Design a protein around this ligand. Structure first.
Ligand SMILES: Nc1nc2c(ncn2[C@@H]2O[C@H](COP(=O)(O)OP(=O)(O)O)[C@@H](O)[C@H]2O)c(=O)[nH]1
Ligand SMILES: [Mg+2]
Ligand SMILES: [Zn+2]
Lengths: 38, 202
Protein backbone atom coordinates (compact mmCIF):
# COMPACT_ATOMS: atom_id res chain seq x y z
CA UNK A 1 0.00 0.00 0.00
CA UNK A 2 0.81 3.69 -0.25
CA UNK A 3 -0.39 6.58 1.88
CA UNK A 4 -4.00 7.74 1.83
CA UNK A 5 -3.73 11.19 0.28
CA UNK A 6 -5.55 13.03 3.06
CA UNK A 7 -2.14 14.49 3.98
CA UNK A 8 -1.50 15.68 0.41
CA UNK A 9 -1.33 19.31 -0.66
CA UNK A 10 -4.74 20.85 -1.28
CA UNK A 11 -5.37 23.14 -4.23
CA UNK A 12 -3.07 26.16 -4.21
CA UNK A 13 -1.11 25.27 -1.08
CA UNK A 14 2.64 25.83 -1.02
CA UNK A 15 5.49 24.72 1.23
CA UNK A 16 7.70 27.41 2.73
CA UNK A 17 11.28 27.04 1.52
CA UNK A 18 12.64 28.49 4.79
CA UNK A 19 10.78 26.45 7.44
CA UNK A 20 8.74 23.88 5.42
CA UNK A 21 5.39 24.94 6.88
CA UNK A 22 2.49 24.51 4.46
CA UNK A 23 0.72 27.74 3.51
CA UNK A 24 -2.51 28.73 1.78
CA UNK A 25 -2.70 30.11 -1.75
CA UNK A 26 -3.63 33.63 -0.62
CA UNK A 27 -0.58 33.88 1.67
CA UNK A 28 2.36 35.74 0.12
CA UNK A 29 4.65 35.07 3.09
CA UNK A 30 4.86 32.17 5.50
CA UNK A 31 2.34 32.28 8.33
CA UNK A 32 4.94 30.75 10.68
CA UNK A 33 8.31 32.33 9.85
CA UNK A 34 7.16 35.36 7.79
CA UNK A 35 9.66 34.69 5.01
CA UNK A 36 8.28 35.74 1.60
CA UNK A 37 7.28 33.06 -0.89
CA UNK A 38 10.32 32.41 -3.12
CA UNK B 1 3.90 9.89 -2.25
CA UNK B 2 5.82 11.38 0.69
CA UNK B 3 3.87 12.75 3.64
CA UNK B 4 5.51 15.28 5.95
CA UNK B 5 4.58 16.51 9.42
CA UNK B 6 5.78 19.47 11.46
CA UNK B 7 7.04 18.12 14.80
CA UNK B 8 7.81 20.55 17.62
CA UNK B 9 10.53 19.37 19.99
CA UNK B 10 10.21 21.24 23.29
CA UNK B 11 11.48 20.93 26.84
CA UNK B 12 13.69 22.68 29.34
CA UNK B 13 17.14 23.78 28.27
CA UNK B 14 19.84 21.20 28.86
CA UNK B 15 17.58 18.15 28.53
CA UNK B 16 19.23 16.96 25.30
CA UNK B 17 16.81 18.13 22.60
CA UNK B 18 19.54 19.21 20.19
CA UNK B 19 21.71 16.16 20.91
CA UNK B 20 18.67 13.98 20.24
CA UNK B 21 17.54 15.46 16.93
CA UNK B 22 21.13 15.51 15.66
CA UNK B 23 21.41 11.70 15.87
CA UNK B 24 19.60 11.55 12.50
CA UNK B 25 22.56 12.27 10.24
CA UNK B 26 20.71 13.21 7.05
CA UNK B 27 18.34 15.41 9.03
CA UNK B 28 21.39 17.22 10.39
CA UNK B 29 23.11 17.66 7.01
CA UNK B 30 19.86 18.98 5.46
CA UNK B 31 18.75 21.10 8.42
CA UNK B 32 17.42 24.61 7.80
CA UNK B 33 18.00 27.57 10.09
CA UNK B 34 14.97 29.88 10.32
CA UNK B 35 16.54 33.23 11.21
CA UNK B 36 13.29 35.04 12.04
CA UNK B 37 12.41 32.42 14.67
CA UNK B 38 15.79 31.19 15.92
CA UNK B 39 14.91 27.60 15.05
CA UNK B 40 16.62 24.74 13.23
CA UNK B 41 14.21 22.54 11.27
CA UNK B 42 15.60 19.04 10.78
CA UNK B 43 13.86 17.10 7.97
CA UNK B 44 13.91 13.53 9.35
CA UNK B 45 12.95 10.89 6.79
CA UNK B 46 11.82 7.48 8.01
CA UNK B 47 11.14 4.63 5.59
CA UNK B 48 7.96 2.73 6.47
CA UNK B 49 6.38 -0.33 4.89
CA UNK B 50 3.97 2.12 3.21
CA UNK B 51 6.58 4.60 1.96
CA UNK B 52 8.64 7.49 3.29
CA UNK B 53 7.48 9.80 6.08
CA UNK B 54 9.23 13.09 6.89
CA UNK B 55 9.13 14.61 10.37
CA UNK B 56 10.28 18.23 10.08
CA UNK B 57 11.58 18.59 13.64
CA UNK B 58 11.69 22.11 15.07
CA UNK B 59 14.59 22.54 17.51
CA UNK B 60 15.19 25.82 19.31
CA UNK B 61 18.55 27.59 19.11
CA UNK B 62 18.35 28.95 22.67
CA UNK B 63 17.43 27.97 26.24
CA UNK B 64 13.83 29.20 26.24
CA UNK B 65 11.55 28.36 29.16
CA UNK B 66 7.92 27.31 28.75
CA UNK B 67 6.01 30.14 27.12
CA UNK B 68 9.27 31.74 25.96
CA UNK B 69 9.17 30.50 22.36
CA UNK B 70 8.05 32.87 19.61
CA UNK B 71 4.49 32.25 18.45
CA UNK B 72 5.52 31.01 14.99
CA UNK B 73 7.23 28.07 16.68
CA UNK B 74 3.94 26.27 17.33
CA UNK B 75 2.08 27.40 14.20
CA UNK B 76 0.83 24.38 12.22
CA UNK B 77 2.48 21.88 14.55
CA UNK B 78 1.00 18.47 13.76
CA UNK B 79 2.76 16.48 16.52
CA UNK B 80 5.21 17.06 19.33
CA UNK B 81 7.89 15.57 21.54
CA UNK B 82 8.26 16.92 25.07
CA UNK B 83 11.68 16.07 26.46
CA UNK B 84 13.06 16.09 29.99
CA UNK B 85 16.20 14.84 31.73
CA UNK B 86 15.76 11.86 34.05
CA UNK B 87 18.68 13.16 36.14
CA UNK B 88 17.00 16.56 36.76
CA UNK B 89 13.60 16.38 38.45
CA UNK B 90 12.83 20.05 37.74
CA UNK B 91 12.85 19.38 34.00
CA UNK B 92 10.17 16.74 34.58
CA UNK B 93 8.15 19.00 36.88
CA UNK B 94 8.01 21.44 33.95
CA UNK B 95 6.62 18.85 31.52
CA UNK B 96 2.98 19.71 32.43
CA UNK B 97 3.86 23.35 31.76
CA UNK B 98 5.18 22.53 28.28
CA UNK B 99 2.16 20.28 27.71
CA UNK B 100 -0.23 23.07 28.69
CA UNK B 101 1.67 25.55 26.51
CA UNK B 102 1.28 23.12 23.59
CA UNK B 103 -2.42 22.29 23.94
CA UNK B 104 -3.13 26.03 24.11
CA UNK B 105 -1.95 26.69 20.55
CA UNK B 106 -2.14 23.32 18.81
CA UNK B 107 -5.05 21.66 20.66
CA UNK B 108 -5.34 17.90 20.04
CA UNK B 109 -2.12 16.86 18.31
CA UNK B 110 -0.34 13.58 19.19
CA UNK B 111 2.43 14.10 21.74
CA UNK B 112 5.23 11.83 22.95
CA UNK B 113 6.98 12.41 26.28
CA UNK B 114 10.66 11.45 26.32
CA UNK B 115 12.83 11.05 29.40
CA UNK B 116 16.39 11.47 28.15
CA UNK B 117 19.82 10.51 29.50
CA UNK B 118 18.75 7.10 30.85
CA UNK B 119 22.31 5.99 30.12
CA UNK B 120 23.25 7.75 33.39
CA UNK B 121 23.09 5.13 36.14
CA UNK B 122 22.09 7.60 38.89
CA UNK B 123 18.55 8.11 37.60
CA UNK B 124 16.55 10.68 39.58
CA UNK B 125 13.19 10.43 37.78
CA UNK B 126 12.63 6.71 38.19
CA UNK B 127 10.72 4.65 35.65
CA UNK B 128 8.10 3.73 38.25
CA UNK B 129 7.51 7.38 39.22
CA UNK B 130 6.54 8.56 35.72
CA UNK B 131 3.00 9.95 35.76
CA UNK B 132 0.69 8.17 33.31
CA UNK B 133 -2.68 9.59 32.27
CA UNK B 134 -5.81 8.47 30.43
CA UNK B 135 -4.81 10.50 27.35
CA UNK B 136 -4.84 8.45 24.14
CA UNK B 137 -2.82 11.14 22.33
CA UNK B 138 0.09 10.80 24.79
CA UNK B 139 2.86 8.21 25.11
CA UNK B 140 6.09 7.91 27.10
CA UNK B 141 9.51 6.49 26.22
CA UNK B 142 12.89 6.42 27.88
CA UNK B 143 15.62 7.60 25.54
CA UNK B 144 19.38 8.08 25.55
CA UNK B 145 20.34 10.39 22.70
CA UNK B 146 24.05 9.70 23.13
CA UNK B 147 23.56 5.94 22.71
CA UNK B 148 20.66 6.09 20.20
CA UNK B 149 18.64 4.06 22.73
CA UNK B 150 14.97 3.99 21.65
CA UNK B 151 15.69 6.75 19.10
CA UNK B 152 13.07 5.55 16.61
CA UNK B 153 10.23 4.83 19.05
CA UNK B 154 8.78 8.35 19.43
CA UNK B 155 8.67 8.73 15.65
CA UNK B 156 7.15 5.29 15.06
CA UNK B 157 4.38 5.90 17.59
CA UNK B 158 3.61 9.34 16.14
CA UNK B 159 3.62 7.95 12.59
CA UNK B 160 1.17 5.21 13.60
CA UNK B 161 -1.11 7.77 15.27
CA UNK B 162 -0.90 10.28 12.42
CA UNK B 163 -1.38 7.76 9.60
CA UNK B 164 -3.99 5.85 11.60
CA UNK B 165 -2.19 2.54 10.97
CA UNK B 166 -1.17 0.67 14.14
CA UNK B 167 0.70 -1.94 12.05
CA UNK B 168 3.00 0.63 10.43
CA UNK B 169 6.65 -0.41 10.60
CA UNK B 170 10.01 1.13 9.77
CA UNK B 171 11.64 -1.16 7.19
CA UNK B 172 15.12 0.19 8.00
CA UNK B 173 16.65 2.30 10.71
CA UNK B 174 17.85 5.77 9.70
CA UNK B 175 21.59 6.36 9.57
CA UNK B 176 22.45 7.55 13.09
CA UNK B 177 25.55 9.10 14.60
CA UNK B 178 27.70 6.38 16.23
CA UNK B 179 26.88 5.93 19.93
CA UNK B 180 29.07 7.99 22.25
CA UNK B 181 28.03 6.15 25.44
CA UNK B 182 26.89 2.61 26.19
CA UNK B 183 23.35 1.95 27.38
CA UNK B 184 23.59 -0.70 30.10
CA UNK B 185 21.39 -3.57 28.85
CA UNK B 186 20.46 -4.70 32.37
CA UNK B 187 19.13 -1.22 33.15
CA UNK B 188 17.35 -1.07 29.79
CA UNK B 189 15.64 -4.40 30.47
CA UNK B 190 14.60 -3.20 33.93
CA UNK B 191 13.41 0.22 32.78
CA UNK B 192 11.36 -1.30 29.96
CA UNK B 193 9.63 -3.72 32.32
CA UNK B 194 9.02 -1.05 34.96
CA UNK B 195 7.37 1.12 32.30
CA UNK B 196 5.13 -1.69 31.01
CA UNK B 197 3.78 -2.06 34.56
CA UNK B 198 3.25 1.65 35.22
CA UNK B 199 1.67 1.95 31.76
CA UNK B 200 -0.59 -1.02 32.59
CA UNK B 201 -1.50 -0.03 36.17
CA UNK B 202 -3.49 3.04 35.10
N1 LIG C 1 24.87 10.91 29.45
C1 LIG C 1 24.04 11.60 28.46
N2 LIG C 1 24.23 13.03 28.27
C2 LIG C 1 23.41 13.73 27.27
C3 LIG C 1 22.47 13.10 26.52
N3 LIG C 1 21.89 14.02 25.72
C4 LIG C 1 22.48 15.21 25.98
N4 LIG C 1 23.43 15.00 26.94
C5 LIG C 1 24.15 16.27 27.28
O1 LIG C 1 23.19 17.25 27.98
C6 LIG C 1 23.86 18.64 27.70
C7 LIG C 1 22.76 19.47 26.92
O2 LIG C 1 22.55 18.83 25.68
P1 LIG C 1 21.67 19.70 24.56
O3 LIG C 1 21.42 18.82 23.35
O4 LIG C 1 22.42 20.96 24.20
O5 LIG C 1 20.27 20.06 25.31
P2 LIG C 1 19.14 21.13 24.83
O6 LIG C 1 19.38 22.44 25.51
O7 LIG C 1 17.81 20.55 25.28
O8 LIG C 1 19.18 21.27 23.32
C8 LIG C 1 24.86 18.44 26.96
O9 LIG C 1 26.14 18.41 27.75
C9 LIG C 1 24.66 16.92 26.31
O10 LIG C 1 25.97 16.40 25.98
C10 LIG C 1 22.26 11.60 26.72
O11 LIG C 1 21.44 11.00 26.08
N5 LIG C 1 23.05 10.90 27.68
MG1 LIG D 1 19.43 22.95 22.05
ZN1 LIG E 1 8.14 29.45 6.88
Amino acid sequence: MGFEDMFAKKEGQWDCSSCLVRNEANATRCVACQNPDK
Amino acid sequence: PQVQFKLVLVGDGGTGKTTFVKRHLTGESEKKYVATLGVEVHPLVFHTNRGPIKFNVWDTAGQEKFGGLRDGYYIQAQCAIIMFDVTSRVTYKNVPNWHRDLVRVCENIPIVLCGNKVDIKDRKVKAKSIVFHRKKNLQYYDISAKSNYNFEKPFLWLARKLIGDPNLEFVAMPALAPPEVVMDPALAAQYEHDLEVAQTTA
